[PDB]
Amino acid sequence: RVKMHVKKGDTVLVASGKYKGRVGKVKEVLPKKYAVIVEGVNIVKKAVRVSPKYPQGGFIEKEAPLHASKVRPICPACGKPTRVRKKFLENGKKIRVCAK
Amino acid sequence: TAYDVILAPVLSEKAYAGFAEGKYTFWVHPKATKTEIKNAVETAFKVKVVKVNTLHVRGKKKRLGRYLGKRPDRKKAIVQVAPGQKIEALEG
Amino acid sequence: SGKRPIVANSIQRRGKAKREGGVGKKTTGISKRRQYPNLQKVRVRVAGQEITFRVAASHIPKVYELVERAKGLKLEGLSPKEIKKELL
RNA sequence: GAGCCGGUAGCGGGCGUGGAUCCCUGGAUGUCCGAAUGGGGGAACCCGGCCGGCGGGAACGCCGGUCACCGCGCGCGCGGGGGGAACCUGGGGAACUGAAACAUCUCAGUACCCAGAGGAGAGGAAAGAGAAAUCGACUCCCUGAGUAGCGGCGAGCGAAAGGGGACCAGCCUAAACCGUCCGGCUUGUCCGGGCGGGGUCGGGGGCCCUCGGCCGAAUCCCCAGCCUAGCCGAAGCUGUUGGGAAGCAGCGCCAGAGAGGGUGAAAGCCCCGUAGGCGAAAGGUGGGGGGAUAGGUGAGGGUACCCGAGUACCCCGUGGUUCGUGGAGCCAUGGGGGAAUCUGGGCGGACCACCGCCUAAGGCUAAGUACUCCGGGUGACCGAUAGCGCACCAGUACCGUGAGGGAAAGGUGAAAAGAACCCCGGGAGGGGAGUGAAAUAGAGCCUGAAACCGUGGGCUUACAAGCAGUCACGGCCC
RNA sequence: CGAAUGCCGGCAUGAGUAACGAUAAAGAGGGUGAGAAUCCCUCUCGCCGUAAGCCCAAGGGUUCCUACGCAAUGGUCGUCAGCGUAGGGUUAGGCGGGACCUAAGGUGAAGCCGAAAGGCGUAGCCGAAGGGCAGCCGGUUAAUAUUCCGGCCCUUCCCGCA
RNA sequence: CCUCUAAGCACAACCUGCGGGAACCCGUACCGCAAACCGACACAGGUGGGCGGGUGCAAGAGCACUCAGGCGCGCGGGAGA
Numbered sequence A: 001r002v003k004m005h006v007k008k009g010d011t012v013l014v015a016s017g018k019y020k021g022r023v024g025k026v027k028e029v030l031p032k033k034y035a036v037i038v039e040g041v042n043i044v045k046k047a048v049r050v051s052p053k054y055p056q057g058g059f060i061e062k063e064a065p066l067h068a069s070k071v072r073p074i075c076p077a078c079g080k081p082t083r084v085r086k087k088f089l090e091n092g093k094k095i096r097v098c099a100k
Numbered sequence B: 001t002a003y004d005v006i007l008a009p010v011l012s013e014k015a016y017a018g019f020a021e022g023k024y025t026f027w028v029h030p031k032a033t034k035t036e037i038k039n040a041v042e043t044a045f046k047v048k049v050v051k052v053n054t055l056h057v058r059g060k061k062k063r064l065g066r067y068l069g070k071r072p073d074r075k076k077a078i079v080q081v082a083p084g085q086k087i088e089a090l091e092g
Numbered sequence C: 001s002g003k004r005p006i007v008a009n010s011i012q013r014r015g016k017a018k019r020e021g022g023v024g025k026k027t028t029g030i031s032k033r034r035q036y037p038n039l040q041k042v043r044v045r046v047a048g049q050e051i052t053f054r055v056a057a058s059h060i061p062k063v064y065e066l067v068e069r070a071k072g073l074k075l076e077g078l079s080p081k082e083i084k085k086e087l088l
Numbered sequence D: 001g002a003g004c005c006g007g008u009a010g011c012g013g014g015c016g017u018g019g020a021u022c023c024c025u026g027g028a029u030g031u032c033c034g035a036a037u038g039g040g041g042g043a044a045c046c047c048g049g050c051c052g053g054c055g056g057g058a059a060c061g062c063c064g065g066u067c068a069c070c071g072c073g074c075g076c077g078c079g080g081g082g083g084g085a086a087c088c089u090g091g092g093g094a095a096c097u098g099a100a101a102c103a104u105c106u107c108a109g110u111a112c113c114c115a116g117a118g119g120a121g122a123g124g125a126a127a128g129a130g131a132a133a134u135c136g137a138c139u140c141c142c143u144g145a146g147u148a149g150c151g152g153c154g155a156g157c158g159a160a161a162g163g164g165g166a167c168c169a170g171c172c173u174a175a176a177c178c179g180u181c182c183g184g185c186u187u188g189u190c191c192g193g194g195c196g197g198g199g200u201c202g203g204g205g206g207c208c209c210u211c212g213g214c215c216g217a218a219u220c221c222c223c224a225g226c227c228u229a230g231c232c233g234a235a236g237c238u239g240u241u242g243g244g245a246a247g248c249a250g251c252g253c254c255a256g257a258g259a260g261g262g263u264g265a266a267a268g269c270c271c272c273g274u275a276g277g278c279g280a281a282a283g284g285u286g287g288g289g290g291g292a293u294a295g296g297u298g299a300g301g302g303u304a305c306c307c308g309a310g311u312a313c314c315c316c317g318u319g320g321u322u323c324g325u326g327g328a329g330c331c332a333u334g335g336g337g338g339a340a341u342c343u344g345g346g347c348g349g350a351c352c353a354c355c356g357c358c359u360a361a362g363g364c365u366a367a368g369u370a371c372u373c374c375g376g377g378u379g380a381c382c383g384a385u386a387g388c389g390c391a392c393c394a395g396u397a398c399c400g401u402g403a404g405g406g407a408a409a410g411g412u413g414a415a416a417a418g419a420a421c422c423c424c425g426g427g428a429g430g431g432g433a434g435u436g437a438a439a440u441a442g443a444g445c446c447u448g449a450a451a452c453c454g455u456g457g458g459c460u461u462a463c464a465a466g467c468a469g470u471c472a473c474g475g476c477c478c
Numbered sequence E: 001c002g003a004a005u006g007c008c009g010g011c012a013u014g015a016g017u018a019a020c021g022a023u024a025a026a027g028a029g030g031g032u033g034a035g036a037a038u039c040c041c042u043c044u045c046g047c048c049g050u051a052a053g054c055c056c057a058a059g060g061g062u063u064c065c066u067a068c069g070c071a072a073u074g075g076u077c078g079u080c081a082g083c084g085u086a087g088g089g090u091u092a093g094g095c096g097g098g099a100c101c102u103a104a105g106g107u108g109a110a111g112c113c114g115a116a117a118g119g120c121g122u123a124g125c126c127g128a129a130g131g132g133c134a135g136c137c138g139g140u141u142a143a144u145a146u147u148c149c150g151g152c153c154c155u156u157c158c159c160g161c162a
Numbered sequence F: 001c002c003u004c005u006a007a008g009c010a011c012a013a014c015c016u017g018c019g020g021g022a023a024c025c026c027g028u029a030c031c032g033c034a035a036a037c038c039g040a041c042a043c044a045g046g047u048g049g050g051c052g053g054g055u056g057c058a059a060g061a062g063c064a065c066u067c068a069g070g071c072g073c074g075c076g077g078g079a080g081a
């Protein structure tokens, strides 16, 4: 509904914060909190588990949601918002112009 | 609507003692809930059930609201002496 | 009371007075209470077969007009419905 | 059109670009109670009958139908029954109040109860209004007008005409007569009963021979359009302090879009959007647009046929209208007397005579108007004691037998990164470590005042007296 | 905003003060536990014993029982609890009700009367710790037991045979 | 329950035994003179029925003690105004 947004599980630039400009991979959309996770915010989760298994070695702990109004998608371009081209039967996301 | 009656058995330390005389107490569908579910247990487990009893159990609970699940009827078969079968002896 | 061929009863005020009255001298009123003027009602008995009405007794000639009839039908036992719906 | 399996956080369990999750529309299943409707019932439960189905079985079972009561027509069938925040009509209908007491009166035909009805209801086509050789249905709004009036002529209540507007529309029925038909009888070339045909101030109609003649529904199928999902929707990059930029600066760009929200803050150009423009297979919806149907086309002159009956009119009793008995008409009508059908009948405010007006005792009739449970937007509307009583799991907890009353209770941060690991402790709670920009932002956690309660420091008091202060000096740490 | 014996919220003071809810009454030794007069056990002591003991209805509803707990509730403490968490637990042809009956009283076809709501009311139906109806004794787990089981007996119905 | 006949059936229908079968819904835990009911309280109050032992005093559901059973009343320790 309103909950649909920029893009889906592809590679995408983030222009947010500390990671102002970082091309991350496939992004794993959240989106009820309107975020993705993609590759940027990598903050440490100081948690054991809920089920006590394979205990604490190091923390290379996982990512964070990264609110999705700052993940600029990519094509042979940089940024350039998505658009809709329909071609009489489909609905494809073509950027401000390069292609694709 | 014959296998929508016998809802579930109960693993319990009392209904492990049902295998010495009289086969195990199932939670039955607490409405449409007759003691003549003998043709709901022998049509399900291919036995010849002599006697069935009946109940009404399982009241309240906290965490903000009441009635722990349901109030489901549950009872048994006093099925004929050793047609007691149908792999039930697992867990007890 | 009832209706059977007419409209139901009404509600009146009373309007007492204690005076001389205008064409003599000064007038007045006293107390405006609700007399409840139940209309004139008479159980009338006619011989369709045994039929009974609560008719208004300014309408007893009207129910005899309703009886001076032959509405083509025999007895179900009670039948004032066909006498009152074949009224005009 | 790529993520989902609701408010999921956890079992990990699956499911999706051969189309899911969702949203809308149409079905299906809808247990039980409830108008409850098979009967009973202390609602959510019991107990049935008939038919059809599973030693699953003839007995107890369960399934799926059907079994209330009332109203309308010919055992047979179509409706009704209850609910709804207000809105409306009718039947009833107070009292506190005000009169500076109070009874008439007012409050008030208000509140409330009951019935009814629907998206509206009401009313409605003149037996009208009242001064004009006039207006021409009804309703609503503004004027009229606080006028005319009513009024213990006190308190107060208070029109209507006219005139501006909105809206617009007129019609069916015995305004008799002909045939039909169960039977009525004194078989009557005829009584009333159902239809049917006639009938609506070439003043009306029916009947008697000139002169022949289609407008258009409120009703019906249609179609836009409207909703009920949505969709496409323009254009900004870099550097900078920073936790973070959109802030600042430079170089731009869109604009039928510079409404707003969120984005780590201050974003026209990141997102959602907005301007603008598309979109309905399915259902509701709707002459707004055109289509047909149903209906409408004794103009004449006559033989006095018919123009709605216990009704009009008169009296008694009252209500309504401005009208409280008054000079009391009118409109309704509870009692009593009781007519005529156009040289009829009513009205024009006692009444009477002229002059007018208009046809009662049968019914329907859109539209404009009131309303706001509902959906949307709008705010010199509120921002958690406010706004609804409820921003939150609230008509809840709690109180009450009951009707009923009826609360409080929002905010971590950008993101849970919601504190791994130690150490004390039984744990709670801490102290480290860690997170984060910030942790006296650490979890019912933003800011977090004051009352209050502590701890540390300065001055000060144990021969003092006071509405606690103030002025004056003096002493002592800043 | 300073007053309304104002309202809502907070915190005082009273105050470590009155009380702690029966003048039936406690004492000790072991446990358990981090911690104990309060929990468990033992051994005395006391108290009721026409109850302060058992059983059933009324009512309350899971308080029952077991295990993990102790912030909260226990007028103290608490390892305990009836409190929190989770899991178990209530078995009936014979007990009590309904597939039976009526009493008062409801409801109520018919019928009556009311402006409407509705008020009556015959039959009928509902209506119960009253009538009627077939059960006694023992054991078992942590909880149920006239229900489970063991013995003996009995009742209704339906079918078949005589 | 016993009985008599109407309707009806007298190829039924009841009755007595003997064989088999079927026996449904709800209640059932626990407290129940109380810390679990009613009194805002683990409240000295209220609460219906049944059993309510023994010995003694003339009897007794009294009273005194005490079986069985159940409690010491969910604050105590002092001191001796």
Ligand SMILES: [Mg+2]
Pocket: none
């Ligand atoms: Mg498609």
Ligand SMILES: [Mg+2]
Pocket: B054, B055
């Ligand atoms: Mg049972």
Ligand SMILES: [Mg+2]
Pocket: B060
């Ligand atoms: Mg509980």
Ligand SMILES: [Mg+2]
Pocket: C027, C028, C029
């Ligand atoms: Mg007067």
Ligand SMILES: [Mg+2]
Pocket: C032
């Ligand atoms: Mg009055």
Ligand SMILES: [Mg+2]
Pocket: C043, C044, C045
């Ligand atoms: Mg008479």
Ligand SMILES: [Mg+2]
Pocket: D008
């Ligand atoms: Mg889910």
Ligand SMILES: [Mg+2]
Pocket: none
């Ligand atoms: Mg699909």
Ligand SMILES: [Mg+2]
Pocket: D020
């Ligand atoms: Mg699907």
Ligand SMILES: [Mg+2]
Pocket: D022
């Ligand atoms: Mg769905």
Ligand SMILES: [Mg+2]
Pocket: none
């Ligand atoms: Mg089905």
Ligand SMILES: [Mg+2]
Pocket: D036
């Ligand atoms: Mg029913």
Ligand SMILES: [Mg+2]
Pocket: none
């Ligand atoms: Mg009933």
Ligand SMILES: [Mg+2]
Pocket: D045, D046
């Ligand atoms: Mg019931």
Ligand SMILES: [Mg+2]
Pocket: none
């Ligand atoms: Mg078969």
Ligand SMILES: [Mg+2]
Pocket: none
């Ligand atoms: Mg069969």
